[model samples]
Target: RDHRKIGKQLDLYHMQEEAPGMVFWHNDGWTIFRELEVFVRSKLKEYQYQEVKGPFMMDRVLWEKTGHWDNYKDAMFTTSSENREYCIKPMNCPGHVQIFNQGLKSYRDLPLRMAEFGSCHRNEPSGALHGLMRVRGFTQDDAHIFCTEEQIRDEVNACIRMVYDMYSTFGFEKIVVKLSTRPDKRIGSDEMWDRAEADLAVALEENNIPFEYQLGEGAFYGPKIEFTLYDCLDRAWQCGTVQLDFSLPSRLSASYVGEDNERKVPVMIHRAILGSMERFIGILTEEFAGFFPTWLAPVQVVVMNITDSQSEYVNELTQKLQNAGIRVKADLRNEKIGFKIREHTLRRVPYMLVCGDKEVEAGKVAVRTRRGKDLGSLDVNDVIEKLQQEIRSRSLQQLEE
Candidate 1:
């Protein structure tokens, strides 16, 4: 069940000697990445978040203002450009602050939610680096909400709801919520911590969700909540977080005109559902054991011909499936039918369609699943309809016999 072995066997991705903690994602693995990205992009629209992109690297002066230079300097990758030190962003919160600082705001723009598929880099010790689970270069499904203190509860509630909906879609029905309170070295006032912590608890309770508190485990700038997913092996992986920051906006001069026409520092709520694309995909690989659902599989179906006589029919059938939005390939190589079947089955393709003189005569295709379940032959249009429905529904079930 190790992702490294599965990745190698399936040609998903690889980590090389030159780039020790980075991934070289192959075409198959990247298909999964793009699908996951589209999934979250739709959610961002549903939740009213304005998608944005920030620089991958920034001036060290900016990091200094955010105190990341002092605390995380050793773990950040830096480069000298035109005699100025620039650090690649280790997180997206500070850059989001730069965006918020761009425009003059009013109370009407109170809940300004901005999201990014932030590409980040954090230098970790070589020995500590694993596969995708611990990569220096990774992308985060990161977002931040600039809102009022009065808006904290609702925003948090919405984030929790999003987490549940997204995780469930990925077949992660089991999750544990952890509310982290003020740390000993925190920056926020005791009253601010009290309210932020309570706001999280109330949001979870309103959803009738149970949670545990992790006292003094929060960031120095604020309190936060984390969502951990329990995979098929019952192993817990922390994949989501919503943090209430009372510090960054003021430090970076993010302010808006309040209801009373007074200048106020907006509170920043930083959140992510899939914390890191690389790490999350690793978890998904192990959870599914490389047998991804039809909707997520790299190659959803494979169409093969029994002999050279049926090659033309197989090509036409493959084109039909591709036209219908299926990720399919034609296996018309001069090889035995059993060889083609075993190859695609080993690749964990969800469905396999075999064409021969019999199938071509009836304008039908013989269907079978990767698990070797024999599904009877169906007409070309019928096959397309069934596969489309399965993909649209994101069904976890295989093409059953």
Candidate 2:
């Protein structure tokens, strides 16, 4: 079966004539999305990023103050609600700034990072829309760090390291890093841009990360670091970004009490490890050809019975695996062993276990890898142990090979 056609045939997701730049995600698509969301949330928990929620719409004045109205107004979707113009948010940084301004901050709260799985809408042109890669509505794994000038490098460095560690776990080895400098129409002074750019460069160098310089490609407020992943097919996708901004905080009235008890505007660093959940999932699906790794697979294993007599035993084994937090299923259909194996193998389940009368009596299941390498009957505990190790390591390579 063609893998490209499987996405449509399986009803994972669909783009419609009614919404030119949007997707209608069905159950199958949402299942995959939930799995990815949980994985990313776990990673963020590891890094101590506190989850926060933000508004989907705000007054046009906020956008104007944050500099998005003048530069991005043409691409923004605006509406008149209550006779006042409001914009559907295209980015999360401005909202995060408002959150920071909520409390009276001090030097003790110098490096506060607020995170959100924010849903955003952008009025991208119809010509730019792809199936899931470029959608009108998408969620970003977004975060903003509000810190003092002295903490800029350390905070940016920590973010870069975390992004690298997270991406490397998913089998992305070739990463392209770029430092985007100030644009021509930016708001800050030349000195401010110089300091921001120098701090970013120092962070990259101190972390021993290689990056290219992109002149005038930064956001209108400040400089940034962009991380692009090269997939298995050598296609490049920009999945992560870290931008340093000094203007937004002041413009939005975000301030903190310094060590000397003087009020000072904080620097804001906007970052996202996975640029957008929908786009990242699309890239991952194509890169692995739908063969997700054990930790991320929707259905990790399928157990098949050779005869009706062994069905009960297979069911018990499936339950045991599920109790251990393994994603496993039982296939008790009346079918030949070869046919069942071929069907599951094509579906790319990491493991297929076959149980017959002899195997049931021997208290073991015949194990086969997705690549059709048979590992003759093995103890159930041994298989479980190996799966645990593979999941812990997030290994993408086929174990049998």
lDDT of 2 by residue, 290-381 (tens): 77787777677899999899999999989888887888989999899899988877767889988989889989888888878888888888
lDDT (Cα, tens digit) per residue for candidate 1, span 1-401: 88999999999998898998999989999999998898889999999999999999889888999876777789999999788999998899888888888868999997999999999999999899999998899999999999999999999999999999999987899999999988888886799888889999999998889999998999998889999999988999999999988888988988999989999999999999999988998998999999998988999999999989998998889899989999999998999999999999999999889998999999999998988898888889987998999988788886655
Cα shift from native, residue 61, model 2 (Å)? 3.1
Candidates in order have lDDT scores of 0.91, 0.84
After superposition, candidate 1 runs with Cα above 4 Å error:
none
TM-score of 1: 0.97
Task: Please give the range of 10 consecutive residues that has the lowest summed lDDT in model 1.
Answer: 392-401
Question: On a 0 to 100 scale, what is the lDDT of residue 94 in model 1?
Answer: 89
